From a paper:
ITC using Man5GlcNAc as a ligand gave an association constant (Ka) of 1.04 (± 0.01)×106 M−1, which is consistent with the range of affinities previously determined for other SBPs, and a binding stoichiometry of 1.05 (±0.01), equating to the expected 1:1 protein to ligand ratio. Despite these two complexes being obtained with different ligands and in different spacegroups, the overall conformations of NgtS were very similar (rmsd of 1.0 Å over 427 matched Cα positions); both complexes were in a “closed” conformation relative to the “open” conformation obtained in the absence of ligand. As with other SBPs, the ligand-binding site was found at the interface of the two domains comprising NgtS and ligand recognition involves a transition from the open, unbound form to a ligand-stabilized closed form. The reducing end of the carbohydrate is oriented into the base of the protein binding cleft and fully sequestered from bulk solvent with no room for additional residues present at the reducing end, consistent with our proposal that NgtS specifically binds the products of EndoD hydrolysis (i.e. having only the single non-reducing GlcNAc residue). The additional α-(1,3)- and α-(1,6)-linked mannose residues of Man5GlcNAc provide a number of direct hydrogen bond interactions with the protein and an extensive network of water mediated hydrogen bonds. The classic CH-π interaction between aromatic sidechains and carbohydrate rings, such as that seen in binding the Man1GlcNAc core, is notably absent between the protein and the mannose residues in the glycan arms, though Trp81 does participate in hydrogen bonding with the terminal α-1,6-linked mannose. The structure of NgtS in complex with this ligand revealed a specific network of interactions, with the suite of interactions between the reducing end GlcNAc residue and the burial of this sugar at the base of the binding site imparting specificity for the reducing end motif glycans.
Author numbering: 40 to 493
Amino acid sequence: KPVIKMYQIGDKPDNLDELLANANKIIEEKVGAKLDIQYLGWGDYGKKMSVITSSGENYDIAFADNYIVNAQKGAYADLTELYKKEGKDLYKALDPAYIKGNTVNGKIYAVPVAANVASSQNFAFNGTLLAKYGIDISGVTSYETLEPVLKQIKEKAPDVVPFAIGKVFIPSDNFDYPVANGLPFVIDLEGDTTKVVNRYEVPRFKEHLKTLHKFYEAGYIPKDVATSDTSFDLQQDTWFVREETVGPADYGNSLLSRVANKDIQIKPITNFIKKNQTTQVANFVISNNSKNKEKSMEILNLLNTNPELLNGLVYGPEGKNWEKIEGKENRVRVLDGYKGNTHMGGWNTGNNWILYINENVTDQQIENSKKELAEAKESPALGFIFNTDNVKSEISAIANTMQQFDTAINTGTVDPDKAIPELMEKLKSEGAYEKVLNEMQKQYDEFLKNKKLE
Ligand SMILES: CC(=O)N[C@@H]1[C@@H](O)[C@H](O[C@@H]2O[C@H](CO[C@H]3O[C@H](CO[C@H]4O[C@H](CO)[C@@H](O)[C@H](O)[C@@H]4O)[C@@H](O)[C@H](O[C@H]4O[C@H](CO)[C@@H](O)[C@H](O)[C@@H]4O)[C@@H]3O)[C@@H](O)[C@H](O[C@H]3O[C@H](CO)[C@@H](O)[C@H](O)[C@@H]3O)[C@@H]2O)[C@@H](CO)O[C@H]1O
């Protein structure tokens, strides 16, 4: 039984050995291999995985970073044939938007987790503090309208971080990204949807960055946001508000209330839509240098199709963390063991449709989810995936410049009125910027042109 090496983002569960022992009972039997998972953390997952992939390291499975760029670098196994056999079952369950968003030169290199194919960005509020301090959030619709409630929590509970964001944070908006959000190129969904634009020059987005900087100056965001490895545990009163992606797989605020083990209230700030990001939010890839591509896909297939296996990991050990509710099909309740770091997250583990539904999820939530999924629309740029063939060096150059300046801007640490012009000047200094922008606009023109009937 070879050991299959999987890399995952974020922090290791405290009972990983138990989780994997439970999981490997099923995997070893069905596949003849043992899964091992190594977790790489949150704050620097991109940098870490870039060492792994650019070095051609042996691994079998990974949660992808910079998927569209690396797929064109040949970092990942083409899954075209594996999806005809080992991954046939998981593949049948994917919404067409997952195929559009993850197809690169006519080939799919990822197993995306079937879950929030559409979603919106939300502020998620700590209900303990809302109730304790009686703070009114009914006006909260944007980064800007957040200000009065952060001012209040700051005055009332000085030990609480008002807005908990960390170094990986990027302000959200109604944008589609033809590459990924570590680059500035977006389609503005509220603007001219035929144009590729620089997010730092979109007026309202520049305004958000100003807002974040004012929050940073006011002490609403951590002083060391740009460098901190501190997390804000969903269960703890260390934070008042944070930004969360929510979609139909979460059943409204039930999932965040379950994981936080308290009432979490949400407020949307972006449109609920299928767009490149929502289809790429959890992609598993197989290393193109893997020596076990078939068993790797068999594991990914099981993670996405076997409810015993998936629930065992996402809920944790049955009996300790959760139990089936008698005479209610596919319903569970969590138990004391589930409280904290003793399970994995559904969104980056496997098809959320095969997850048991927890007791705290209401019939209204179930009906809302069904309705939201049925009505979700596609962004006009869903499936517009930028081809890097002509701009390989210029893309690297842009990414290099971005890595060096973008954390201080995105977190509000530096004044964006000073920093954005410095970043733009550096991006333009050797013309890598202009070349990539023009090529992206030319491809986008073709993409849109070819959908119009002759
Ligand atoms: C409840 C649930 O499972 N919800 C999921 C969503 O998580 C998922 O959205 C995606 O979420 C990832 C992960 O971010 C969240 O989890 C991070 C880890 O939290 C856990 O571990 C911590 C210890 O490391 C614990 O402290 C914590 O209790 C928990 O155990 C967490 O750190 C993160 O919150 C921080 O970071 C976010 C992002 O910067 C920031 O907004 C927060 O304020 C806070 O500082 C979250 O709680 C996330 O990485 C994904 O982000 C990418 O994709 C989105 C959507 O495109 C982009 O906007 C964003 O810029 C990133 O590119 C995404 O948000 C959804 C996916 O559909 O599925 C739900 O079911």
